[PDB]
Write a sequence for this structure.
């Protein structure tokens, strides 16, 4: 299991205390909010830099 | 700033593998950095430096050996330099050097470019043997002026690299490697030698990624390369740099595809086993053998500070790779994956979290390391609200700035 997870074949992680293998189901299927957040911060900081330079 | 104590270094093999001024420098480094063995190292160094008519470094090594012998005469309670060596060596060296100079300057009156280049290369070799670095550099430069063919350019590059290695002018080494590689349309394997030189120069300049990449392309067919670096140390350097910089998939791909580092790891089975345990999550044995290689190569010509940084990076990467496949890992088990204690592992994990690239939380109650997987939305909303507050605050500030300018407000 460790070798498989190291090879990125398994999208999951191991709980050795309880002899357990927990997989990240990643059923959300999103990652659009990450792009939105990057777009939000980069351009708002871009706007702040432009306003400071223009004044 | 350096110098440690460690036994079990094999002086004979390490001295015989290298040869030339490189061997002299390595023997001097081993003697100066390894006490309780400096006696035999200095004796062998003086025995070999007497060969090929050295002058000043011979005086330094003789003084060091005399001091060491005097030290030996007081602990269990100094050799003569045979100053006739000065006379005979100086006489013979002067005679042959002036004969060669006369021949070369007569050839300069004959005006042949290739002959002048070859004579200047011979003069540079003679000066390097005599212990004249700057003189050899000037001879090799007057040779570089009179180049005719691609092989002449290659020989010039090799000579300049060899000289600047001793001069520690690694910038010249890198420039000449680039010149010898990029120019002539990038059985006789010269590119392997050039890549070895570039890799060693980069490692001496505190570079690990590009140095490892250059070493990976070095084929074992080169075999004999004693003027710069022995194949065993080349394998050690490549393995250490790859372990420190290349992650698991990159490690596997490069080592397998190179097919020459397979042989190199065959020469050095310790590094091969360490890399295999790194891939197979056996970091305890990996790091104990790493400490063994530590004590073994702490007195290497160009390794010590670089290898210390490499080992720090190696242990950090080992911890990062070990915790990565787990969302809730017991710190007892993680500490048992090495000889470290619970407290030291906890401190190292805290330092890694502070630096980053582990993304973890330390539940010190049960000593379990929980990975951090935070929802993007909660972080996104928090920083978006902070941005809006900052935008409003900057909106106020710019709004304020228009006040002092429209109403002409300033210090009189």
């Amino acid at each position: 299991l460790v070798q498989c997870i190291l090879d990125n074949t398994i999208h999951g992680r191991i709980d050795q205390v309880n002899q357990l293998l927990e997989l990240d189901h990643q059923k959300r299927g999103g990652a659009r909010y990450t792009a939105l957040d990057k777009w939000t911060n980069q351009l708002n900081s871009l706007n702040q830099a432009v306003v400071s330079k223009l004044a | 700033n350096y110098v440690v104590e460690n036994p079990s270094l094999d002086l004979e093999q390490y001295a015989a593998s290298y040869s030339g001024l490189m061997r002299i420098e390595r023997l001097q480094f081993i003697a100066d950095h390894c006490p309780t063995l400096r006696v035999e190292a200095l004796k062998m160094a003086l025995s070999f430096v007497q060969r090929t008519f050295n002058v000043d470094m011979y005086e330094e090594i003789h003084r060091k050996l005399s001091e060491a012998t005097r030290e030996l005469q007081n602990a269990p309670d100094p050799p003569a330099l045979d100053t006739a060596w000065v006379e005979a060596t100086r006489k013979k060296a002067l005679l042959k050097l002036e004969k060669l100079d006369t021949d070369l300057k007569n050839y300069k009156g004959n005006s042949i470019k290739e002959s002048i280049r070859r004579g200047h290369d011979d003069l540079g070799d003679h000066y390097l043997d005599c212990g004249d670095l700057s003189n050899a550099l000037k001879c090799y430069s007057r040779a570089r002026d009179y180049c005719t063919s691609a092989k002449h350019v290659i020989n010039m590059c090799l000579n300049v690299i060899k000289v600047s290695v001793y001069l520690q002018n690694w910038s010249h080494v890198l420039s000449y490697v680039s010149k010898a590689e990029s120019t002539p349309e990038i059985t006789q394997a010269i590119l392997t030698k050039l890549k070895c030189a570039a890799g060693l120069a980069e490692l001496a300049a505190r570079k690990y990624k590009q140095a490892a990449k250059c070493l990976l392309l070095a084929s074992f067919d080169h075999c004999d390369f004693p003027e710069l670096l022995s194949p065993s140390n080349v394998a050690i350097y490549g393995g250490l740099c790859a372990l420190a910089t290349f992650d698991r998939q990159e490690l596997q791909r490069n080592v397998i595809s190179s097919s020459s580092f397979k042989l190199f790891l065959e020469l050095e089975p310790q590094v091969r086993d360490i890399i295999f345990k790194f891939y197979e999550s056996k970091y305890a044995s990996c790091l104990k053998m790493l400490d063994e290689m530590k004590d073994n190569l702490l007195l290497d010509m160009y390794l010590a500070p670089h290898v210390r940084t490499l080992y720090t990076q190696i242990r950090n990467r080992a911890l990062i790779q070990y915790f990565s496949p787990y969302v809730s890992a017991d710190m007892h088990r993680m500490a048992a994956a090495f000889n470290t204690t619970v407290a030291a592992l906890e401190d190292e994990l805290t330092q890694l979290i502070l630096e980053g690239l582990i993304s973890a939380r330390v539940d010190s109650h049960s000593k379990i390391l929980y990975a951090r997987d935070v929802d993007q939305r909660s972080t996104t909303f928090e920083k978006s609200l902070l941005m809006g507050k900052e935008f409003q605050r900057r909106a106020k500030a710019m709004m304020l700035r228009a006040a002092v300018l429209r109403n002409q407000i300033h210090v009189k």
Observations:
- The beta strands of chain A are 12-15, 20-23.
- Residues 21 and 47 of chain A are 46 Å apart (CA to CA).
